[PDB]
Amino acid sequence: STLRIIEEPQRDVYWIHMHADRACFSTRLVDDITGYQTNLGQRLNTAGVLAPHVVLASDSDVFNLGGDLALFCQLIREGDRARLLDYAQRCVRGVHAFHVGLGARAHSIALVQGNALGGGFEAALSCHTIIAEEGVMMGLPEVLFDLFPGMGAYSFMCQRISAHLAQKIMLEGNLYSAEQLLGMGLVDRVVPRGQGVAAVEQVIRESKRTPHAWAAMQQVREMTTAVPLEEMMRITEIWVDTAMQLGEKSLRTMDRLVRAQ
């Protein structure tokens, strides 16, 4: 119930609207996404659908503010590494599924009509195409509480920019506008406010006419530049070990962000 799902079976377009009912990746939201990804992917495979379209969107005035910091604070203070790892691994599965097209060679499109921070920005980067509206801010603020983006930020940015620049962005903790991200190559299209849906429809209509070409390109990605799940899993292992070592200054910073969200 954290998701509002809009399915168009005859056109094979599927809309995932986050935050249907803090606009962050809570355990419930993550389980609902992975659960739907697995469900839709299996239906698409058995029906032999060629190049389906999956859209990740939001019903909130923001896109997604990232990890459940209130949950982080609690698990770190309690020393519960096992549950934090579990959360982190499930977040990885969610974003990796978008990256490999749900195992059904889907075209994943991120529709970002509000701010996307941390895990939220990582979720947008996990999609093949990012559509952003003017005035939208994105960034990776986890360094501000002495952590790093471990939901694939590094893996996904390295597809678009250099490894060195990806490192800078992850460690500076700056926010960037949609126009700035476009110039940096981290966003694919910027449209005026309230025009995002139409822009997504144009992308869908463009790749719907070349479904064989799209599906073949996914196979080529799979055997070349695609980010392996295992690589991301090992990155969250480092992420959890780092989070467990965080001090009271970082925890208070996280608490302040929780209240502002």
Give the binding site for another protein (CB under 8 A). Answer: 62, 65, 115, 117, 137, 139, 141, 144, 173-175, 189, 191, 195, 198-199, 201-202, 209, 249, 252-253, 256-257, 259-261
Pairwise CA distance, residues 112 & 159, whole Å = 19
Answer yes or no whether residue 162 interacts with its own copies by CB under 8 A. yes
* Candidates 14-22, 39-47, 68-76, 207-215; binding stretch for its own copies (CB under 8 A): 207-215
Interface pattern 121-150 for its own copies (x via CB under 8 A): -------x-------------xxx-xxx--
79 binds, among its own copies, another protein, none (CB under 5 to 8 A by kind): none
CB of 113 to its own copies, least distance (A): 22
CB of 58 to another protein, least distance (A): 14
195 binds, among another protein, its own copies, none (CB under 5 to 8 A by kind): another protein
Q: Which residue has the tokens 């990155």?
A: 235
260 binds, among its own copies, another protein, none (CB under 5 to 8 A by kind): another protein
Answer yes or no whether residue 174 interacts with its own copies by CB under 8 A. no
CB of 19 to its own copies, least distance (A): 27
* 129-133/137-139 β-pairing: unpaired
256 binds, among its own copies, another protein, none (CB under 5 to 8 A by kind): another protein
225 binds, among another protein, its own copies, none (CB under 5 to 8 A by kind): its own copies
CB of 210 to its own copies, least distance (A): 5
Pairwise CA distance, residues 1 & 200, whole Å = 24
CA dihedral 218, 91, 239, 225 (to 10 degrees): 0
CB of 136 to another protein, least distance (A): 10
Answer yes or no whether residue 47 interacts with its own copies by CB under 8 A. no
Burial of 245 (0-12, 13-18, 19+ CB in 10 A): exposed
